[PDB]
């Protein structure tokens, strides 16, 4: 259209953070042919969309109750409060009744069914067919021993969700390097040239050194052995240049998105280097043609014995860390047929094939012609993912993988959406299997799709390697997820921004001449800026209203974050407590968000097995670039805080948390409570810190409810080693002083172990979500050596009593070590 549509464009932009229409930095058009090619699958699940249950986005798992859920139940039995105006009743209901079912035995009891069950002062709906014990809210109030409060009002209106409708022969390979040319610049230099097919060289030609000038030229054909037609597609020309030290790399598609052999001439804009790490992989050039080194280029183009069946078996058996020797991937690729039968051997087969070998790539794609066998396995998360990492480029063996998640319910989406987004940074090509998968999700489900924009968003704002794909995947999903969801981001943006600017002016600019300042801004935009509700990202279900600009503060700390609290936007809301967000700048939260939402897997991972290890992974979301928000735990204290409070230097006392706990708990009974929940949250939090490797933490870092629930935060990190904080003043509330026993320090020793081996039991899933975290979240080129510590970490190999040894030791190792490096940390200071 016009006036209408290029202001709907805009209208996109600014919610993307990007021009998806900018096409400064492109040399091919592989970006704008996948806006256009992600426009059949955007339509296709709009078309699809129930919009009664799209709008309502009843929120549901199809995974049994927990046990520890069920004791909570005594008469097979649970009450439910229902709202009308000012009326309040409290239905008896069976675990196993339908929402349907109970507006039925609501309405007999005391445009019918033109009413729905909407839980108090949130956005989240009980609807749908699905058993009472099955919605997560009624999961989270009986984990919470809370009263399940729903006020019932009309459906939300499906109308609000509207969508605005719109080569190649038998020559060996070779490349010409003309030479590179940067405006500014140990004095020697050389192109090296990798042909790439997932991480693996398959040839690598290099150029003869020269002297480190602005402008070094070459103009030298670089041949390599492989021929044009053994050239795999997905493979990368990786180009990069070593000073003996890497300090510039860039990579250019041998193959592009409509199968064409590239060539032509080429001037690259490179990253610099400040080994592993996804950002390197990156198929896009560095935007800042200014000052980065650029680099010109032309392109002119039966049965098996006994004890081998068993060498294989073991072969399969070893973990996906475990190197593959030549020896190994003979074996495994001499016995496709037989390895094929195994799921779990897919991602050791498929690291087996020569993919510089047509002919051999061939019968890999007969292999997987073969489906069956994998096909009907059970979903295996773990194992999917290893198929959708570094290792792997070839697009069908990806998409068998990404086949695989579409059985994954919403529930399970959610578990793993942060990690399926990184997962796109290992996409050869911009129009992927794994980008529709999660843009089919995202439009599926509007808790997914608000997630999705906030992963997105998150990486279109600070990573230049990857925010073109990522801003073409948000566009698409954008255009498909209705208006109402279109107006909702909005004013999360908008808001985010207007308090960006803030937190801005404040660092620069802790004395009442800021808290002055403070004030003065919050009530500016207040009064005429910020909207009168938005969503909260980390927890969009809740909507937050006005500002309380009374109890804004600001923190005192290295950086200095903002302390928010809104007022509910909700009337209906069961309570009268503020929101309170923090929003911090000058730390990459990305980070954090990998940790926490592994630190969530594990606690399904505990579920799967009866388990509650009382985690509290709080809300936290990376907005901008070095900026972003994390949520406030009501009724939480620093530990130390309590302990600098008796308040010295150093000097920490055994007891201050114990009469802390004792001084918030009103009841012995409230206090033993207490008591547990911290012998829990401890022990979840020793094992979840040990086998990231982040134990070691200090007191600030760790915090407490008052209802004696631990947790830790800032994984920035924020600056003798001891394997996780088990100090002391945590031992005293067990009730042992060093060194002894106490029924509360047994059960803390029981717990830890039964937590660990039940890690170890899914030890293949961690240990790719840990290398794929490092590769795609953390700043350094991460080495083999950071990886294969979370080996070591799960004791792989060993048995259920070496590793509970293993443990056990761990543990004591703590307690010899006192107060030794919380004191430290001072020392040190
Ligand atoms: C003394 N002072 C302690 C912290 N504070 C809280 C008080 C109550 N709850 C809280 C917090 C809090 C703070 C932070 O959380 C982070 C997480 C990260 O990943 C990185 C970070 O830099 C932070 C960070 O500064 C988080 N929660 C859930 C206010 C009071």
Redesign the pocket.
């Known amino acids: 259209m016009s006036e209408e549509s290029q202001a709907f464009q805009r209208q996109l932009t600014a919610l993307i953070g990007y021009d998806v229409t900018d096409v400064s930095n492109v040399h091919d058009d592989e970006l704008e042919f996948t806006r256009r090619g992600l426009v059949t699958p955007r339509m296709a699940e709009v078309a699809s969309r129930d919009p009664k249950l799209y709008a309502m986005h009843p929120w549901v798992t199809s995974k049994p109750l927990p046990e520890y859920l069920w004791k909570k139940i005594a008469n097979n039995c649970i009450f439910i409060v229902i709202h009308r105006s000012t009326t309040s009743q409290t239905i008896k209901v069976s675990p196993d009744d339908t929402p349907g079912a109970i507006l039925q035995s609501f309405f007999t009891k005391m445009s019918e069914q033109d009413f729905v069950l909407r839980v108090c002062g949130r956005d989240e709906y009980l609807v749908g067919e699905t058993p009472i014990k099955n919605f997560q809210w009624v999961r989270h109030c009986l984990k919470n021993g809370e009263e399940i409060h729903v006020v019932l009002d009309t459906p939300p209106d499906p109308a609000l969700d509207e969508v605005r409708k719109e080569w190649d022969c038998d020559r060996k390979f070779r490349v010409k390097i003309r030479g590179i040319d940067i405006p500014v610049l140990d004095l020697t230099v050389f192109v090296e040239a990798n042909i790439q097919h997932g991480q693996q060289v398959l040839c690598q030609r290099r150029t003869s050194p020269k002297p480190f000038t602005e402008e070094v030229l070459w103009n030298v054909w670089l041949e390599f052995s492989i021929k044009i037609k053994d050239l795999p597609k997905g493979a990368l020309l990786n180009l990069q240049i070593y000073c003996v030290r890497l300090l510039y790399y860039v990579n250019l598609l041998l193959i592009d998105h409509r199968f064409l052999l590239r060539r032509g001439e080429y001037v690259l804009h490179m990253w610099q280097i400040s080994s592993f790490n996804a950002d390197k992989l990156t198929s896009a050039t560095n935007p800042d043609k200014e000052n980065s080194m650029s680099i010109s280029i032309l392109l002119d183009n039966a049965e098996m014995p006994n004890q081998l069946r068993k060498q294989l078996e073991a072969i399969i058996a070893t973990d996906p860390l475990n190197p593959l020797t030549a020896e190994d991937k003979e074996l495994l690729w001499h016995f496709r047929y037989e390895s094929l039968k195994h799921p779990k051997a897919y991602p050791k087969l498929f690291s087996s094939v020569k993919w510089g070998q047509q002919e051999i790539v061939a019968k890999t794609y007969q292999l997987l012609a073969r489906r069956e066998v994998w096909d009907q396995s059970a979903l295996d998360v773990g194992l999917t993912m290893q198929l959708l990492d570094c290792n792997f480029s070839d697009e069908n063996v990806r998409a068998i993988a990404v086949q695989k998640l579409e059985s994954l319910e919403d529930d399970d989406v959610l578990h793993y959406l942060l990690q399926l987004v990184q997962a796109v940074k290992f996409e050869p090509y911009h129009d992927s299997a794994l980008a529709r998968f999660l843009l089919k999700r995202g439009l599926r489900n509007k808790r997914i799709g608000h997630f999705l924009f906030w992963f997105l968003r998150s990486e279109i704002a600070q990573s230049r390697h990857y925010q073109q794909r990522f801003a073409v995947i948000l566009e698409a999903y954008l255009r498909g997820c209705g208006t109402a969801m279109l107006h909702d981001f909005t004013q999360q943006v908008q808001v985010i921004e207007m308090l960006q600017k803030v937190t801005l002016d404040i660092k620069s600019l802790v004395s009442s001449q800021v808290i002055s300042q403070l004030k003065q801004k919050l009530e500016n935009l207040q009064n005429s800026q910020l909207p009168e509700s938005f969503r909260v990202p980390y927890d969009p279900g809740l909507k937050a209203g006005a500002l309380a600009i009374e109890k804004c503060k600001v ?1 005192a ?1 290295k ?1 200095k ?1 903002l ?1 928010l609290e809104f007022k509910c936007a909700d009337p209906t809301a069961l309570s009268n407590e503020t929101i ?1 967000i ?1 929003f ?1 700048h000058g ?1 990459d ?1 990305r980070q ?1 968000m990998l ?2 939402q592994i630190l969530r897997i594990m606690e399904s991972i505990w579920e799967t097995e009866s388990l509650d290890l009382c985690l509290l992974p ?1 809300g ?1 979301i990376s907005t901008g670039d070095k900026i972003g928000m ?4 009501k009724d ?1 204290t ?1 530990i130390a ?1 309590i302990q600098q409070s008796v308040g010295n230097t150093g000097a920490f006392k055994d007891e201050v948390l114990n009469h802390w706990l004792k001084e918030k708990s009103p009841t012995e009974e409230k206090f033993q409570a207490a008591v547990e929940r911290f012998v829990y949250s401890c022990a979840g939090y020793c094992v979840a810190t040990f086998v990231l490797g982040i134990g070691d933490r200090h007191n ?1 870092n760790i ?1 407490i409810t008052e209802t004696g629930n631990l ?1 830790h ?4 990190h ?1 600056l003798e080693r001891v394997p996780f904080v088990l100090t002391p003043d945590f031992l005293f509330v067990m009730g042992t002083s060093g060194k002894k026993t106490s029924p509360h320090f047994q059960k803390f020793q029981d717990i830890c172990v039964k937590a660990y081996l039940a890690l170890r039991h899914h030890t293949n899933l961690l240990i790719i979500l840990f290398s794929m975290m490092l590769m795609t979240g953390m700043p350094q080129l991460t080495s083999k050596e950071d990886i294969e510590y979370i080996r070591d970490a799960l004791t792989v190999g060993k048995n259920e009593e070496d590793a509970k040894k293993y443990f056990l030791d761990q543990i004591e190792v703590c307690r010899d070590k006192g107060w030794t490096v919380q004191f430290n940390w001072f020392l040190h200071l």
């Open positions: 923190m700390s950086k974050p302390w309170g923090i911090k730390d939260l954090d940790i926490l709080y936290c994390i949520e406030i735990v939480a620093t805080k600030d915090m947790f935060i800032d994984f920035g924020i």
